[PDB]
Ligand binder design. Structure first.
Ligand code: HEC
Ligand code: HEC
Ligand code: HEC
Ligand code: HEC
Ligand SMILES: [Ca+2]
Ligand SMILES: [Ca+2]
Ligand code: NA
Ligand code: NA
Lengths: 376, 125, 357, 376, 129, 354
């Protein structure tokens, strides 16, 4: 309960009193760990943006990374690096566009790679985490393209170069499963499997249609690459779970996040990153609230936690703030991260009790995206 | 005010996020940065793509198709931000999805988002 | 009177006595069973029509007369955009100016002059009776008045509800009588969110009372020459169809290659397409537009020939700003557009859809 | 009464009722006029910034211009072009620096000139309007360089090229008097006259020292190029007026903004653009409040107005808001613009009476600088 | 929270704008963006140039010269913005002036402003302050 | 004890009997009336000193011994920067290890060996008594013990209040006993905000208790050879003075050309400057730092020669991070610095300032 600024004032006072020297220098961030959490601020479409690197245990900003227009951040699960695909222009928001990927050292935060993307091929959209995606081995970044058509761009992080664009069907999002394979969700209600070589026509297979045309799958499904779990809520809180760990899609049984009385009384998911999945606990978290059916991008004040296997409700937390996005640390005794775009504040909760533990405020202009690494 | 309440359209202030034509707008109303309801501000570039919605006009009891179009080539205005989602569908029905920067076709390859206009293109059916 | 003038028009429209050799009426080329287009096979398939001599071919495809009464008369608007008029190059001001043209065109009905036309009208007791009741006694004896009066009767007849009944599925759906299929509804949504609607909707914004799927503007969409039609027409390998620049009094080189946006009503049944009838299938007309947007090699290939679309007949003044939309139509969206475009077929031509579907 | 958004809703209602078509297009800004006001947002040192073009009469944003890091805006007095000196980096706030001048058409707001400044020569500092300056004929742009030593850059806007750097003595700010001449303020408390030919060392001449080492002159003096009036408040509200209208510096009676008593009760100037000068009215405006001597950059709630000729206080306005920056339109019956960094709001006041007429909020992040053309 | 009042230094919280050493700080406190009181955050480049101030230390009644140094080459942090001006002089006395981006000397020619540190460089003696 | 030892060192320090021809003592070169430097004009002016033999010139400028006792013993700190020691190249560890070297150096005092130093000490009955009281009976009969004890007395002598008085105007101001002049305080402000403080201050931050205006590090500031001095040294026009790299056991090439940050104390009166006495004026010394920051034509030119400074004797390992500060010292600031540096004069040498 001594704040961090108070501890600091105390120690600097003791250093002055004792004649202690120290060399003013550039700090290193502490080693990445399970409770580092990254919050990205798309800044409501501003041309430049920020990512905050946060120690979630201390509630402390340990670093920042600047980005351009609607960058897609990724974070290597093993903690070796972070990267983003980003877009800049020669004259702020006009002139020559350069898309590029930067890779950063997660301790010095220095860029160790800056890889131009030819022909400005990024999909500029409100930030969806799964629109830019690391393969499991960390060597390849895949980025979605929409214009002129759905396409996926392959970037070699190891050799630091753009590789090629892949032609795909009318599909969206990129859930990588292997060094050379990803899934996409298609307009027709199937998933598409894309398997791609250095050159050649991608191998593209579709699953069966797994949802009717009137059931709407949200833009921010939770995907645990290490568990190959794709947790995909619909607008009503019905949750589609797809198991991709065998390398092909297995459709798991559907669970309702909300009860029928809740649904009858207007309860629905809503926010940006509406859903989190804790791998080790096999638990789903969903931001829900009482709301009309078309207010599905508004903040929510409640998180339901449910067992991913049974659909049993384990908790319903009153977050006590307007929360747009959640995620969880992937360690035991996980933290539940609850970001309020309105408050520009990451609230950090104990995921078990739902209690708010601390918070980090002043995170830019419109922060929306929480990313944690799955380190363990 | 209640963000979660059913959105109630009005036909009396275009700069307010409940104006009827803004029922599925995402961004900033161009009228607040030097454009108008259906024109882009000086120095920006008007996209030709758009996402659509069926918006009820409480003036005439009719539902109208509003095909939003972005004014591009500038950093986000920062004025009159609004986000409504009536009828808004996920990105895989892009014709109805509004997180996409619909800046395609804008002169000079402009793709940065400055604000959105709300012209009517049809009666809804 | 408004009834009678049109009734007279009805009779002229189907009367082959208005052609030199008496083989051809407006209805020969503008066949009411075919949404007022030419079902006849010529040396260039259905691309261009054969005149009364039985050998002469035009250089442009015969357009429908359906909904042609909705086109405003030709004018330059404040934008400096030309709009409206008749013929693909807008060289007629309105229906009445257009009507006397097939009559005297040695490539079409081929009467030598007005006097020859009037002499045909006098031969017919019913015409002497019908014209004289609308235009006065001895009308048929003044070749100028006779020819003008027939053109007016013909223009009035094309303005009747028979030519623009507005009873397409699309119309009935807009009235709430029925609904679109899902494919039609996607088609419609594509149409109004993609570049199509920049040219094929009456208005820039708001709602049209009698939508005919054209803004009546002139655009060079970069079409290649139709080689067989151009061979048949005989105009030469060095000939350039300059579009609107050919209208007398248009001098502005930026109009070269621009053609009037056609109404898409009955487009399903009035193939082949474009001003030179170059594309046979509706879908090919739609795919053409991907040549400006798609990065795929197939986007450059006419699927009807398997060869490149071809260099534009007029490489300049292309509507690159509307055409280069940054978004390619996938086949799902092309299918949806065909289905939507088929909802624009008038009631009476819905059975013609069967074969094309 | 009816707001701008309201009247716009009824015009739109009426056009739909009447079935009136209209082409969606790019609007032209209304021709520059006296009541056009420019608000620059240095965004508290953000790497990108915005300038708002505002119709002071209707209190409407009529356009915007993006800028880079701490750009210096300039606005030609005749309304024919605006320009800024701005600073971009190849990777947001990092990498290769480009300083450049852009010249803008004031109705389309399109860039008409983009003039690179060799060797990243711009002075990076919280925005001082007189650190970059148009010459009276609009043909030349002069910007300050602090590093490696005070110097002035000459930019030819007519030929659209940078010319050379003038090496100067230990001096600051740039007040052009002529196509080849400008004054600066020197550490030793003189002004310096810098006349620059086409070639060679400019000819530098110092005036008398006109203030003691312990009298402090604010960073934002008002300067009316068309009057040649350099108006310089000190920290205590003492105002130096220098006439530069003859080619050489003649020193006017120095004058007090606050009363000897009032200063006894801790009235001091304070804010950013603390001072405004209305050329035709020969009149000074000074933001003041009750403050400690070392709170000289805080917002003031009051404006004092005084005759540049006598020092007679003409009015004192209780602004009604926390104001950092003032300026005035140079027309007759001028608006007094009262920009609040905190509120992000331009308050538009009647300059004679001080009542708030109207206001334009949402002016970026930390708007600071108000510019107006003097067109009469 | 009365902005015009005389500044009241405290020696108890460095993230607050009234921390004694921040007596002429302009921008953001580096300790809020992953620096510390006298170190830059990761990725930034510490300038060699400074503006100095004599800052009264409430805790020992001594005045200390604080030579503010800027951490450069990032966009402004946005956290714990602070502007104090104790003894701050106009730009023609650059040595005491805090509107200047004091990024000179920063590695990689970095000149964009991220945050400012507050190290003590001596005991005071100023005549203006 | 500590007094008696320093008193013995006081005798030795002024004793020419510790030189071969008995013509020279430590005080000949470290003249107390000249803040312990060499007033004597030789072949290369005051740039270098002349040994006992009347002809051998050194290749370095004789530094002041004032405040030498505040320098830490030579060491590599945890950031890898070498610090402290004695001589311009840090080649001696401390004052003790340094004291014997001039005695046995043939270009200086030129005693052949320790035994001849001990013999000289035996010749003076006052030394027999003084040494024996402190180091025991027969100390002078053993040349090793005698020389080491002489070295210890000298070191002790140099650690006295008389070498490091802290009575400069700067010291009096810091005690709040007096005030700096407007110029002197400007110089002080400039000194601590400009690059100078990055090297010429004891600590990185905080307040030093006994400031001697040097952080005791080694830096190559990229100085040219002292042409005449080098000619007078006889070391040859082929020679390279590698500064720190010359201390035995320093092998790291990054140190070639680096020299100890001298204390600026008394700097106003110990001209000429730098390790080679290459600059006669203090103003020049300060100016030399503008070659790195200033783009102006006259930054390139040594104002004492009117010619370019000269290429660095050692063109690598320059401290560019620190020297390329991006800001030029204008005349006003160079004046302010001189004024400030003059306040680092000990009270007793305040008369020397003209
Ligand atoms: C075949 C030889 C034809 C006969 C007989 C008639 N028409 Fe025709 N029509 C024909 C062609 C090849 C064209 C296009 C020519 C061009 O230069 O563009 C036309 C065009 C019209 C139009 C204009 C329609 C439009 O622009 O959309 C109208 C109104 C028209 N035709 C009517 C018309 C009438 C009234 C006829 C008998 C008097 C008639 N046509 C005969 C082909 C032929
Ligand atoms: C303006 C630049 C246009 C855009 C965008 C689209 N169309 Fe178009 N269309 C245009 C013109 C000028 C023409 C006539 C071209 C010529 O010289 O012949 C057309 C033609 C068609 C047709 C054929 C109709 C007929 O021959 O009777 C079809 C079926 C058509 N257009 C459809 C279409 C669709 C589906 C579009 C969006 C993908 C589209 N057009 C865009 C002008 C323009
Ligand atoms: C001239 C012939 C000299 C005599 C006699 C003595 N010293 Fe000296 N001293 C001289 C020079 C040229 C140098 C620099 C040598 C180099 O290689 O750098 C020195 C240095 C010292 C030092 C080091 C001071 C420092 O590094 O800051 C000390 C402590 C020193 N000298 C002491 C000293 C004593 C004790 C002497 C009598 C035995 C003595 N010096 C004689 C020049 C000459
Ligand atoms: C480390 C990079 C330094 C910086 C920055 C400054 N000085 Fe320095 N100084 C330094 C060294 C290593 C030396 C000796 C260089 C050599 O090889 O001889 C010096 C020397 C001086 C002197 C001469 C002192 C004497 O000879 O006794 C003066 C007057 C001096 N330095 C002053 C000075 C000033 C005013 C600075 C800021 C302009 C400055 N130095 C920077 C180490 C470094
Ligand atoms: Ca046809
Ligand atoms: Ca010396
Ligand atoms: Na053909
Ligand atoms: Na013509």
């Amino acid at each position: 309960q001594e704040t961090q600024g108070q501890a600091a004032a105390r120690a600097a006072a003791a250093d002055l009193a004792a004649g202690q020297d120290d060399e003013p220098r550039i700090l290193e961030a502490p080693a990445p760990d399970a409770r580092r959490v990254y919050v990205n601020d798309p800044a409501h479409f501003a041309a430049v943006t920020q990512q905050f690197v946060i120690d979630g245990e201390a509630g402390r900003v340990i670093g920042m990374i600047d980005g351009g227009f609607l960058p897609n951040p990724v974070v290597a699960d093993d903690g070796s690096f972070i990267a983003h695909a980003s877009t800049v222009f020669s004259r702020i928001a006009r002139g020559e566009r350069t898309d590029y990927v930067e890779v950063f050292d997660p301790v010095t935060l220095l860029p160790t790679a800056d890889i131009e993307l030819p022909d400005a091929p990024r999909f500029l959209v409100g930030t969806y985490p799964w629109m830019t995606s690391l393969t499991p081995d960390g060597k390849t970044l895949l980025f979605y393209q929409f214009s002129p058509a759905p396409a996926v761009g392959v970037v070699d992080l190891e050799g630091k170069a753009f590789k090629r664009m892949l032609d795909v069907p009318d599909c969206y999002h990129i859930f990588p499963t292997a060094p050379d394979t990803f899934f996409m969700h298609c307009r027709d209600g199937s998933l598409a499997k894309v398997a791609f070589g250095t050159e050649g026509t991608p191998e593209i297979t579709h699953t069966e249609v797994f949802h009717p045309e009137d059931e709407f799958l949200i833009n921010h499904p939770a995907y645990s690459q290490k568990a190959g779990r794709l947790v995909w809520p619909t607008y009503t809180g019905k949750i589609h779970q797809i198991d991709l760990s065998s390398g092909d899609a297995k459709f798991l049984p559907a669970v309702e996040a909300l009860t029928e009385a809740e649904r009858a009384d207007g309860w629905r998911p809503g926010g940006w990153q509406q859903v989190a999945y804790h791998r080790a606990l096999d638990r789903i978290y969903l931001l829900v609230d009482q709301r009309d059916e078309w207010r599905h991008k508004t903040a929510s004040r409640f998180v339901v936690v449910l067992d991913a296997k049974t659909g049993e409700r384990l908790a319903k937390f009153e977050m006590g703030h307007e929360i747009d996005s959640i995620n969880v640390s992937q360690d035991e005794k996980p933290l539940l991260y609850a970001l309020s775009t309105g408050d520009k504040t990451l609230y950090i909760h104990d995921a078990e009790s739902g209690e708010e533990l601390r918070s980090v405020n002043q995170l830019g202009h419109g922060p929306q995206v929480i990313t944690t690494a799955d380190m363990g | 005010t209640d963000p979660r309440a059913k959105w109630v359209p009005q036909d009396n202030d275009i700069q307010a996020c409940d104006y009827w034509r803004h029922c599925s707008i995402d961004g900033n109303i161009c009228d607040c940065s030097g454009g108008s309801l259906t024109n882009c501000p000086p120095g920006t570039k008007l996209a030709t793509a758009s996402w659509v919605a069926s918006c009820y006009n409480p003036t005439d009891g009719q539902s109208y198709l509003i095909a939003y179009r972005d004014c591009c080539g500038y950093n986000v205005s920062g004025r009159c931000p609004c986000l409504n989602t009536e009828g808004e569908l996920p990105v895989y029905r892009p014709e109805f999805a509004n997180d996409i920067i619909w800046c395609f076709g804008a002169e000079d390859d402009a793709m940065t988002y400055h604000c959105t206009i709300s012209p009517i293109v049809g009666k809804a059916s | 009177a408004d009834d009678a003038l049109a009734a007279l028009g009805a009779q002229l429209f189907v009367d082959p006595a208005l052609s030199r050799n008496a083989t051809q009426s407006c209805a020969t080329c503008h066949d009411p069973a075919r949404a007022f287009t030419d079902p006849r096979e010529g040396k260039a398939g259905l691309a261009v029509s054969v005149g009364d001599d039985g050998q002469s071919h035009g250089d442009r495809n015969t357009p429908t007369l359906g909904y042609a009464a909705l086109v405003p008369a030709f004018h330059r608007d404040a934008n400096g955009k030309y709009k409206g008029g008749q013929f693909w190059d807008g060289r007629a001001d309105d229906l009445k100016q257009q009507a006397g043209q097939p009559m005297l065109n040695p490539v079409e009905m081929a009467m030598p002059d007005r006097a020859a036309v009037a002499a045909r009208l006098r031969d017919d007791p019913a015409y002497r009776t019908g014209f004289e009741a609308l235009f006065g006694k001895g009308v048929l004896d003044d070749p100028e008045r006779a020819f003008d009066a027939a053109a007016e009767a013909l223009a009035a007849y094309q303005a009747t509800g028979e030519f623009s009944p507005f009873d397409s599925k699309y119309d009935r759906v807009m009235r709430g009588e029925e609904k679109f299929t899902p494919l039609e509804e996607f088609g419609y949504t594509v149409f109004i969110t993609w570049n199509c609607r920049l040219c094929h909707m009456q208005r820039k914004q708001g709602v049209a009372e009698r939508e005919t799927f054209t803004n009546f503007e002139y655009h060079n969409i970069g079409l290649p020459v139709n080689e067989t039609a151009r061979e048949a027409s005989g105009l030469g390998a060095d000939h350039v169809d300059h579009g609107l620049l050919a209208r007398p009094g248009i001098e502005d080189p930026a109009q070269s290659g621009r053609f009037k946006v056609p109404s898409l009503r009955n487009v399903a049944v009035t193939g082949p397409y474009m001003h030179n009838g170059v594309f046979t299938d509706l879908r090919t007309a739609i795919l053409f537009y991907n040549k400006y947007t798609s990065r795929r090699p197939e986007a450059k290939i006419n699927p009807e020939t398997g060869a490149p679309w071809g260099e534009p007949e007029v490489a300049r003044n292309l509507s690159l700003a509307e055409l280069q939309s940054g978004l390619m139509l996938d086949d799902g969206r092309v299918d949806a557009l065909v289905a939507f475009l088929e909802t624009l077929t008038d009631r009476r031509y819905e059975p013609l859809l069967e074969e094309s579907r």
